[PDB]
C-alpha cells in the first residue's frame, strides 16, 4: 500500500539495482582518498635555511658554518647564521623521500607554518558549506542533477588545485572540492537508500563502509605509485571526470519524483527499471491511477528542553568523534614507519574493528560499545602523544588501535543517533549531527595549528576532547529494547521508564 509494493513489483534483486549501486559507489574510494590526501600531498620534508650566494662554499668546506643545528642533529629549520638572521634567501629541501609537496613549492614553513593547516580548515569549511546548502539545493532540484554537478565540480576543483599558481588559489579550490565532496558523500547514500527496497537498507551502508576502506587502501597504493603532489592530486581527481561523464546514466529516485507532486516521471522510471531488469510483463500493469492510489525543523529542536539536551549531547558526541578521528588520521608524518605502510595498515584495521563493534552491539549493547570505543580512543591518543618520538613500532600500534576505536565509535554513534531520535525529527537530528561532525573536522586542523606553542599539544587536545565528551554523555539512555520512539510525548514517557 505504498511505493514499496511497487518496488517489489518492479524488482529488488534485479541486475539494474545491483549494477547502479556498484556503479554509483565506486567514486567513494577517491572520496576517502581526497579527504585524506593532505598527508601525501602536503608532507613536510626536512629543510633548512639556504646560505646566501655571497659566501663561497668552496672555501667553507661544509654547510655547518652557515646553519645552526638543533638538538636532534639536523640543521635549524627556520634560522641562519650571519657569518643570526632568518631565512631571507628561502629554504633548501631534500628529495630522498618526498620529491615535492606544497610546503616545498610555496615554502609553507616557519613564519608560514600555519598555512597548510589553514588550507585544510578551508577545505573542511567547503565540506560544511557544500553539505548545508547543497542538501537544500538537492531537495529543491533533485538527486541525479546534483550528483552529476558534484562529480564535475570535484573533478574540476581537483585538477585546478593540482595546478595552482599560488597558495590562495589552492585554498579556494580546496574549498570548492570540499563543497562538491560533501554533497556527493551525503547524496549518493540517500539516492541508493531511496531506490533500493527495505531488505538491503544498511546493507547498502555496509557496502559503503567496505568501499571507504578499499579507498583507504587505494590512496596508499597511488601514493606509493605516484609521490609527486602535482601528479598525485591529478591521478586521484581524474577518475571523477569520467565519473561526471558516465553519471548521466543514473536514474532518479522514484521517491523524490513522487514527492515532487508528479507521478508520470515515477511511472516512466519504474517502467524503465522493469525494462532493464527484464520483467516488463509485471511492470506493464503499472499505470497512473495505480501510482496515485498506492503512494498516499531546528526550531522545535532548540525549543523543547529535553530535545535541547538530547541535541546538545549528540552534538558534542559528533563533534568529539570527528574531531579526534581527523586529528589522528591527518597526523602520520611523525610516526616512524613509512607513510604508505601505515596508511595501508590503517585501512586494514578499519574492517576488524567494525566487525567487533557490530558483534558487540548485536550481543552486549550500543551505549556501552560507544563508551568503550570513545574512552579507549582518547586514552590511546593521550598515551600516543606522551610517548617520546624515539619509539616507532609501539607508537604505530597505538595509532592503529586508536583509528580502530574511532571507526567503531563512528559506527556506534551513527546507529545510536539513528535509533534514538523520535521519528518526527529523526532525519533533522541525523543531518545536524553530520553537520556537527563536519564542523568538528573544520576545527581539528585549527587545533593542530597550535603545534608552535607545544609540538605534542595537538595530540593532547585531540585526545582530551573525546574523554570529556564521554564523561558528559550521561543523559543518553540505552536503546537495546528497540522501542523506536515516534513523538516527543512518547519520548518523555519512555524516558522515565
Amino acid at each position: 500500500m505504498a511505493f514499496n509494493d511497487l518496488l517489489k513489483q518492479v524488482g529488488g534483486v534485479g541486475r539494474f539495482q545491483l549494477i547502479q549501486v556498484t556503479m554509483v559507489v565506486a567514486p567513494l574510494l577517491l572520496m576517502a582518498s581526497h579527504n585524506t590526501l593532505q598527508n601525501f600531498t602536503a608532507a613536510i620534508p626536512p629543510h633548512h635555511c639556504r646560505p646566501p650566494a655571497n659566501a663561497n662554499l668552496s672555501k667553507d668546506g661544509g654547510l655547518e658554518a652557515w646553519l645552526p643545528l638543533d638538538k636532534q642533529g639536523q640543521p635549524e629549520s627556520c634560522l641562519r647564521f650571519t657569518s643570526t638572521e632568518p631565512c631571507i634567501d628561502g629554504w633548501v629541501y631534500d628529495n630522498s623521500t618526498f620529491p615535492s609537496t606544497i610546503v616545498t613549492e610555496w615554502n609553507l614553513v616557519c613564519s608560514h607554518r600555519a598555512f597548510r593547516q589553514l588550507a585544510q580548515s578551508l577545505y573542511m569549511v567547503g565540506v560544511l558549506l557544500g553539505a548545508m546548502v547543497f542538501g537544500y539545493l538537492a531537495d529543491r532540484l533533485g538527486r541525479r542533477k546534483v550528483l552529476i554537478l558534484n562529480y564535475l565540480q570535484t573533478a574540476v576543483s581537483g585538477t585546478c588545485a593540482a595546478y595552482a599558481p599560488n597558495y590562495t588559489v589552492y585554498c579556494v579550490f580546496r574549498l570548492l572540492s570540499g563543497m562538491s565532496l560533501a554533497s556527493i558523500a551525503i547524496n549518493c547514500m540517500t539516492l541508493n537508500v531511496e531506490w533500493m527496497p527495505i531488505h538491503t537498507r544498511a546493507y547498502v551502508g555496509t557496502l559503503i563502509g567496505y568501499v571507504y576502506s578499499l579507498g583507504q587502501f587505494l590512496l596508499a597504493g597511488i601514493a606509493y605509485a605516484v609521490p609527486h603532489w602535482r601528479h598525485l592530486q591529478l591521478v586521484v581527481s581524474v577518475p571523477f571526470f569520467i565519473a561526471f561523464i558516465y553519471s548521466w546514466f543514473f536514474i532518479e529516485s522514484a521517491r523524490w519524483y513522487s514527492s515532487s507532486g508528479r507521478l508520470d516521471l515515477t511511472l516512466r522510471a519504474l517502467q524503465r527499471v522493469a525494462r532493464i531488469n527484464g520483467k516488463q510483463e509485471e511492470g506493464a500493469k503499472l499505470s497512473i491511477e495505480v501510482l496515485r492510489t498506492s503512494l498516499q525543523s531546528a526550531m522545535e529542536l532548540l525549543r523543547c528542553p529535553t530535545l535541547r539536551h538530547l541535541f546538545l549531547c549528540l552534538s558534542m558526541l559528533w563533534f568529539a568523534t570527528s574531531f579526534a578521528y581527523y586529528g589522528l588520521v591527518m597526523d602520520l608524518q611523525g610516526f616512524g614507519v613509512s607513510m604508505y605502510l601505515i596508511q595501508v595498515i590503517f585501512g586494514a584495521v578499519d574492517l576488524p574493528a567494525k566487525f567487533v563493534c557490530f558483534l558487540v552491539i548485536n550481543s552486549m549493547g550500543r551505549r556501552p560499545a560507544q563508551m568503550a570505543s570513545l574512552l579507549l580512543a582518547g586514552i590511546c591518543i593521550l598515551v600516543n602523544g606522551i610517548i617520546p618520538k624515539s619509539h616507532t613500532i609501539i607508537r604505530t600500534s597505538l595509532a592503529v588501535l586508536g583509528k580502530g576505536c574511532l571507526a567503531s565509535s563512528f559506527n556506534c554513534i551513527f546507529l545510536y543517533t539513528g535509533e534514538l531520535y523520535p521519528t518526527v525529527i529523526r532525519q533533522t537530528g541525523l543531518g545536524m549531527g553530520s553537520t556537527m561532525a563536519r564542523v568538528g573536522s573544520i576545527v581539528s586542523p585549527l587545533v593542530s595549528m597550535t603545534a608552535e606553542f607545544y609540538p605534542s599539544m595537538p595530540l593532547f587536545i585531540f585526545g582530551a576532547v573525546p574523554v570529556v565528551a564521554s564523561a558528559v554523555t550521561a543523559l543518553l539512555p540505552e536503546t537495546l529494547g528497540q522501542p523506536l520512539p515516534d513523538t516527543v510525548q512518547d519520548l518523555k514517557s519512555r524516558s522515565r521508564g
Binding site: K59, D60, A65, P68, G73, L79, T82, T84
Partner: protein, 115 residues
C-alpha cells in the same frame, strides 16, 4: 644588553688541562642556549659543545664526545668549558653564543697546543 666576555686563553702543552670561562650578565645562565663554536686557523665554524636551559640536556659532536665536558655556575652566572686531552689540531678560537638566535658572537679566546 648581554655581555659574554671570555678569558682563559694561553699557551698549554698538548694534552694539558684548562678551564676557560664565559662570563655572562643581564640574564640567568639557566634560561638560554650557552653554545660553543671554534675556528681553527684556515678552517670554518665548527660545533663542539652545547647546553640548554636548566641543564637537563646536553649534546656534543663527533670530535667532542667523551673527551671534553661543559659546566655551568648559576651563582656566578658563568659557563665553563674545561679542556683535557688536547691534540695539535685543536688550536682554535672558541666562540660563546647567547642563543641559537643571538647576534652576540663572542670575542673569542685563543688556545694553543704548541708541542
Amino acid at each position: 644588553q648581554v655581555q659574554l666576555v671570555e678569558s682563559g686563553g694561553g699557551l698549554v702543552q698538548a694534552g694539558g688541562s684548562l678551564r676557560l670561562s664565559c662570563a655572562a650578565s643581564g640574564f640567568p645562565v639557566k634560561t638560554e642556549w650557552m653554545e660553543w663554536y671554534r675556528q681553527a686557523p684556515g678552517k670554518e665554524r665548527e660545533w663542539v659543545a652545547a647546553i640548554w636551559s636548566y641543564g637537563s640536556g646536553t649534546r656534543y659532536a663527533d670530535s667532542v664526545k667523551g673527551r671534553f665536558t661543559i659546566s655551568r655556575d648559576n651563582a656566578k652566572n658563568t659557563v665553563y668549558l674545561q679542556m683535557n686531552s688536547l691534540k695539535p689540531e685543536d688550536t682554535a678560537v672558541y666562540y660563546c653564543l647567547v642563543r641559537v638566535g643571538s647576534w652576540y658572537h663572542g670575542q673569542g679566546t685563543q688556545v694553543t697546543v704548541s708541542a
